[PDB]
């Protein structure tokens, strides 16, 4: 790997520089190198890993959606035939997106998840596993789509079980996990009622725990609660 010769601490330092420069492909490559050093990641390092790949895949997903929409219009009745280019280029972006998801899932499987023993790290990584299988599911159309969806479901479900047992209802990782699992239900698993129920119960249980929090923790939790509320407003 191209980062094999760089110190772990230098990789982390450069990931932070790349973040400041909004160079998220570089940031992801640096954090991949840091993971491949084989030591567990701290809370901050896990967040650096997550931010980098979220931004990389977010750009690819946005581009895939633009191209998929163009492609769908090209296949309408009365559309002029333009040749294979739209499909080809959508497939190119899709393949690159899948490659990024496979890379992240490979880091989680070798060997982030199996070494993660604390609730905060184990839930964080399982949420990530659910997220990147969900991004694979967004573009899946073939005979493996059901298995991809079930892999996302299973990762989210294990993360939910641990988070409910080991974390308070206001924990921001627990909240963001529930938010993403609710989006999975709504737009991947064709279960909008499950999505709405999860979002509401998650919001209501966090509301009831806010009184235990410092001012700074209150700010962190209410920020994600507002996203749950916004989704509920959109969905009902």
């Amino acid at each position: 790997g191209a980062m094999g010769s760089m110190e772990r601490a230098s990789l982390i330092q450069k990931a932070k520089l790349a973040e400041q420069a909004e160079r998220y492909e570089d940031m992801a490559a640096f954090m991949k190198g840091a993971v491949e050093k084989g030591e567990e990641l701290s809370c901050e390092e896990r967040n650096l890993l997550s931010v980098a790949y979220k931004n990389v895949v977010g750009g690819q997903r946005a581009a895939w959606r633009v191209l998929s929409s163009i492609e769908q219009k090209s296949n309408e009745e009365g559309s002029e035939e333009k040749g294979p280019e739209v499909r080809e280029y959508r497939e190119k972006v899709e393949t690159e997106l899948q490659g990024v998801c496979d890379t992240v899932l490979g880091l989680l499987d070798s060997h982030l998840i199996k070494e993660a023993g604390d609730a905060e790290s184990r839930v964080f990584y399982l949420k990530m596993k659910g997220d990147y299988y969900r991004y694979l599911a967004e573009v899946a159309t073939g005979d493996d789509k059901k298995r991809i969806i079930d892999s996302a479901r299973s990762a989210y479900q294990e993360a939910m079980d641990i988070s409910k047992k080991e974390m308070p209802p206001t924990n921001p990782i627990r909240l963001g996990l529930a938010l993403n699992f609710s989006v999975f239900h709504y737009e991947i698993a064709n279960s909008p009622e499950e999505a709405i129920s999860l979002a509401k119960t998650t919001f209501d249980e966090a509301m009831a725990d806010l009184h235990t929090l410092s001012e700074d923790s209150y700010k962190d939790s209410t920020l994600i609660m507002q996203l749950l509320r916004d989704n509920l407003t959109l969905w009902t």
Binding site: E19, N47, L48, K54, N55, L175, G176, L179, N180, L234
Partner: peptide, 10 residues
Amino acid sequence: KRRWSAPESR
């Protein structure tokens, strides 16, 4: 508006 998914802590 497009639904929210979880933002990054950072």
